[PDB]
């Protein structure tokens, strides 16, 4: 098959051939608008793996995000805090830049559903992704039993609640076991359950 060589090839990102194509692609995206639509995915192997299907209702959107770390938004770097909270630099966002970029695409395209996103390239300033989006009101998506789960109401703004793979990884859902004791079924819900003080009806 063709796609067993494209997948093997794409793992050699440090090669000269792939570094040249990434260099050209990042130049073009640095001048187009921040969020815009591309006709077909530039990485059709990785897009298909995450869920892209070349059918009606599947669209691909490229988002450019400014990577690195920003400062704590305090005016003139002045916070009235105890020395344990006085740091301005070196504070990292919990949500990965991929999940942050997915939300911007979702907010911009409010009538579609975010499926997943993958990595394209980066430079000294930017990092570029491509987001797979599905139109839930297309007749093709609705009438296909394997994909009409996206038409459920709870999928409205999937990435904002934290249901996409990029967003779910930031929630802690990367594995199972005793390493993920605090993220069993949701870190905040798990915390509330452990903190419940059960007062039985008949107690000593």
């Amino acid at each position: 098959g063709a796609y067993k060589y494209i997948n093997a090839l794409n793992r050699k990102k440090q090669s000269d051939v792939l570094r040249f194509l990434r260099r050209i692609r990042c130049w073009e995206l640095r001048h187009l608008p921040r969020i815009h639509r591309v006709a077909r995915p530039t990485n059709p192997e990785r897009a298909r793996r995450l869920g892209y299907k070349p059918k009606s209702g599947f669209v691909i959107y490229s988002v450019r995000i400014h990577r690195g770390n920003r400062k704590v938004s305090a005016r003139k770097g002045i916070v009235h805090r105890k020395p344990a909270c006085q740091g301005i630099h070196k504070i990292k966002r919990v949500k990965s830049l991929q999940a942050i970029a997915e939300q911007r695409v979702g907010k911009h395209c409010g009538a579609l559903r975010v499926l997943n996103s993958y990595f394209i390239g980066q430079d000294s300033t930017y990092r570029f992704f491509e987001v797979i989006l599905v139109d839930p009101f297309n007749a093709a998506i609705r009438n296909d039993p394997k994909m009409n789960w996206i038409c459920a109401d709870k999928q409205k703004r999937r990435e904002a609640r934290g249901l996409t793979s990029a967003a779910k990884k930031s929630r802690g859902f990367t594995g199972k076991g005793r390493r993920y004791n605090k993220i069993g079924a949701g870190a905040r819900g798990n915390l509330k359950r452990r903190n419940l003080l059960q007062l039985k009806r008949y107690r000593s």
Binding site: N195, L196, L197, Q198, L199, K200, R201
Partner: protein, 265 residues
């Protein structure tokens, strides 16, 4: 006493009261009742294995598991696809633990299969399975004669000897009979070793009055009732030193370190 109370956080919004407890009982019971009304053996709580518990603290107690392994279904001659539709839980994730686990859960399925009665997929009396079971009836009766007669010849010695020991214990409440049965049992086992059976048995499908039972795990008991065990005190047991055997076992394991160090020097 140095007090340890974790009330310095907001416990008032952490309080959960059980005022809904008397009403949960009614709610769950009404759904259990409604489930049996809908399709009665759906609440039958599909049959489950008899697995041991974990750790040395619990390992001597049996408890219900989740689903029979695919090796236990083959041993009991059940199709794994048909098992889920006749109230049998299946767990392909479970790897077989022992031969004894395989045997014990093999009789659990066999005992369940004899009790089970499957109604025809179509109520009308002209259903195929009802028609086929009438068509091959003469072949089954011919086959039943061979099974009955050649069972009746293979167990002639074992059945007769088993009667003797049963009466031997009755009169005594013996050594000669026990030796005889033990020697026969070895030969029968050795005869079987010196061999192709049905892949799947038949599903028992018939028409019967609907006696509805709410589960099957309470019908097939996990373990037989326990009684006082008594043994013949012999000279061999009187001289067995359990303390010496435990310290030898403890010291042999602790001596595996010195063995490894000795070679490497």
């Amino acid at each position: 006493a140095v007090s340890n109370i974790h009330f310095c956080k907001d416990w008032r919004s952490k309080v959960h009261t059980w005022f809904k407890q008397p009403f949960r009982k009614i709610r769950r019971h009404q759904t259990r009742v409604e489930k049996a009304k809908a399709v009665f053996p759906a609440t039958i709580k599909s049959l489950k294995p008899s697995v041991h518990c974990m750790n040395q603290r619990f390992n001597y107690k049996l408890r219900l598991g989740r689903g029979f392994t695919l090796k236990e279904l083959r041993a009991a001659k059940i199709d794994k696809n048909l098992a889920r539709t006749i109230g049998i839980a299946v767990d392909p994730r479970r790897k077989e633990s022992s031969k004894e686990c395989l045997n014990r859960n093999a009789q659990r399925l066999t005992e369940y299969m004899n009790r089970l009665v499957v109604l025809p997929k179509v109520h009308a009396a002209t259903a195929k399975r009802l028609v086929l079971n009438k068509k091959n009836a003469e072949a089954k009766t011919k086959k039943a004669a061979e099974i009955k007669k050649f069972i009746a010849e293979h167990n002639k010695t074992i059945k007769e000897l088993k009667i003797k020991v049963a009466a031997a214990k009755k009169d005594y409440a013996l050594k000669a009979c026990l030796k005889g049965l033990k020697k026969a049992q070895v030969a029968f086992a050795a005869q079987v070793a010196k061999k192709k059976t049905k892949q799947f048995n038949k599903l028992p499908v018939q028409q019967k009055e609907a006696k509805q039972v709410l589960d099957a795990n309470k019908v097939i008991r996990l373990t037989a009732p326990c009684t006082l065990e008594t043994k013949t005190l012999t000279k061999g047991m009187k001289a067995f030193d359990a303390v010496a055997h435990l310290r030898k076992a403890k010291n042999v394991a602790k001596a595996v370190s010195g063995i490894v160090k000795g070679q490497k020097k």
